[PDB]
Design a protein around this ligand. Structure first.
Ligand code: KDE
Lengths: 219, 221
């Protein structure tokens, strides 16, 4: 029963700005015998294993840049990132080793950046999938900011809402953009009744949709 | 290289047992405490337990969440760490990492492994269908063409997707799997110079370790 908790849950900071985040302990982490605060901070970039950044509250793991600064004592700790980089996109965790080990809930750091329009691309069903009796139309909406984006699917000039799967990537560690995948799944017989297939993306970057289309009799 | 490498993950049924292993090399194993940490998808890190070093007689300590159900052991002949997990339930579906822990003064986790994913489900192993995504009919005038692979209808997670066996690393977006009616589906795009495709061949390599599936799908016009 040492409860670890972090603040905030998430935030977004532009590159070159300062980040500060907090970590609480339900009981002091100061060892009276060794006089260290047994509190570590870890960085888990998207898709990766956690990496140690700081230990004993304020000692930098070697290799770790001087723009990461751990501070605090007792029950209250702070990680500060100065001149934040695009690659600092990660979830940050504090961890006590004063009595066994316990992780806090984590702080998710978004990077704020300038609005970008998506590159939209549409893909007809492959012949190998059709031969099985189904048909997936895929639409990629790549390298856009902010994450908020709408996708409408249109068959023969008409909207279709059933059978859509969407998936957003985690933010990009280098250019801070998002990407998204939209997949429409029909049967082959459903697919072969209609001619026009349209992926329509509305993003805040323009007042007209980005529209990618293909015609099935052109296949 | 100090290296740590977990194995033994895969699908298991509610109530079942499963043992995980963690291969170590590149450091003096007996000198180190060794920990298991878990992470449900999209969730927080959770410490499970450790086994102490030789100086501390290889004693174990467990978190209350697993104490009585999980067992940690080590093989000092071969520098291998183990996690026995019994009476598994849905909550235990997670990535399990082994971490190189304490050495007597030093208080940190400097080395973790890549993780092994455990899925606790009544659902059946189902391999993916891999479908190429070649453009239909547009001007490819961009200087940049985007291609794809669709990895559809598999269980359990994970899959791995590379392009040209890792040679194409830049401009790849692999999109997190989405669960719809007990099967996963994901996709991955690659953006190469239109100069380079179709004239240079582009292949997605896909694996689904749960079914020992290995696919090399060439993207053909
Ligand atoms: C003489 C062994 C005591 O060290 C430990 C422990 O083994 O419980 C491990 C340390 O990482 C640390 O958690 C410590 C605590 O007593 C507080 O330092 O206990």
């Amino acid at each position: 029963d040492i409860v670890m908790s972090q603040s905030p849950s998430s935030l977004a900071v532009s590159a070159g700005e300062k980040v500060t985040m907090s970590c609480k302990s339900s009981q002091s982490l100061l060892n009276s015998r060794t006089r260290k605060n047994y509190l570590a901070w870890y960085q888990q970039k998207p898709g990766q294993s956690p990496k140690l950044l700081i230990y004993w509250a304020s000692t930098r793991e070697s290799g770790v840049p001087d723009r990461f600064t751990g501070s605090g004592s007792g029950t209250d700790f702070t990680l500060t990132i100065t001149s934040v980089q695009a690659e600092d996109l990660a979830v940050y965790y504090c961890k006590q080793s004063y009595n066994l080990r316990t992780f806090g809930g984590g702080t998710k750091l978004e990077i704020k950046r300038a609005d970008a329009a998506p590159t939209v691309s549409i893909f007809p069903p492959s012949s190998e999938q059709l031969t099985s009796g189904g048909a997936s139309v895929v639409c990629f909406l790549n390298n856009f900011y902010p994450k908020d984006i709408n996708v409408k699917w249109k068959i023969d000039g008409s909207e279709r809402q059933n059978g859509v799967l969407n998936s957003w990537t985690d933010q990009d560690s280098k250019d801070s953009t998002y990407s998204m995948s939209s997949t429409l799944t029909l049967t082959k017989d459903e697919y072969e009744r209609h001619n026009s297939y349209t992926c329509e993306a509305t993003h805040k970057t323009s007042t007209s949709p980005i529209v990618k289309s293909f015609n099935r009799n052109e296949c | 290289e100090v290296k740590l490498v977990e194995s033994g993950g895969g699908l298991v049924q509610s109530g079942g047992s499963l043992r995980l292993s963690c291969a170590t090399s590149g450091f003096t194993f007996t000198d180190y405490y060794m920990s298991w940490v878990r992470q449900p998808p999209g969730k927080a890190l959770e410490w499970l337990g450790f086994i102490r070093n030789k100086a501390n007689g290889y004693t174990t300590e467990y978190s209350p969440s697993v104490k009585g159900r999980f067992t940690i052991s080590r093989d000092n002949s071969q520098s291998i760490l183990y996690l026995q997990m019994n009476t598994l339930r849905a909550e235990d579906s997670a990535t399990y990492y082994c971490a190189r822990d304490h050495d007597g003064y030093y208080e940190r986790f400097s080395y973790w492994g890549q993780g092994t994913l455990v899925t606790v489900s009544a659902a059946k192993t189902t391999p993916p269908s891999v479908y190429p995504l070649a453009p239909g009919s547009a001007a490819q005038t961009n200087s940049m063409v985007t291609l794809g692979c669709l990895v559809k209808g598999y269980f359990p997670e994970p899959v791995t997707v590379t392009w040209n066996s890792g040679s194409l690393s830049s401009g790849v977006h692999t999109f997190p799997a989405v669960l719809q009616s007990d099967l996963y589906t994901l996709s991955s795009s690659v953006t190469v110079p239109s100069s380079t495709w179709p004239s240079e061949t582009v292949t997605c390599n896909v694996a689904h370790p749960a079914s020992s599936t290995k696919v090399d799908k060439k993207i053909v016009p």
